[PDB]
């Protein structure tokens with residue numbers, strides 16, 4: 724059901740320091756090649772009074788290139804799909820939590836994202852829009868119980884680095900649990916290299932285009 728070319732649709736509802744918003748978007752890519760693009764539109768609550776960059780990594784791990792010796796847990800979860808839950812802890816105290824549901828309907832992926840950002844300084848780089856994109860990341864993947872029910876799924880850990888407009892970087896520690904909706908064979912531990920780029924945007928970041936490349940490899 725996962726073709727060499729696949730489209731997706733995404734909707735995000737969220738709030739950051741109490742500012743509520745909604746985003747709708749579409750994307751496409753080559754799931755076995757590890758490449759994808761997305762175009763997002765702020766449909767409620769725009770222009771956003773915070774950095775787009777804290778949202779960009781929440782808009783698609785079915786598009787990770789895996790070698791044949793790493794079981795592709797998230798691709799194998801389809802057509803039913805998978806869920807993921809994420810916590811990002813930023814170095815100045817900010818917190819972002821996310822829940823996501825991924826399914827396959829009528830030939831395209833459907834992504835439903837819920838996001839809450841809290842504990843951000845009112846004068847910090849996120850609420851003042853003083854960031855300019857993510858450095859490349861390496862996510863450490865490993866089997867484990869992330870939702871506390873005693874049964875293993877797939878976990879990921881990342882140290883992410885956000886570029887600051889004034890120079891230097893703003894770090895976040897990220898933990899994600901990925902849960903297939905049906906029993907799927909789990910891989911052993913491995914690493915995924917990821918780069919997410921903002922490829923275009925309008926003046927107030929109410930229309931934004933993204934490009935991501937991701938590839939798994941042995942540790």
Ligand SMILES: [Ca+2]
Pocket residue numbers: 867868869870871872873874875876
């Ligand atoms: Ca579990």
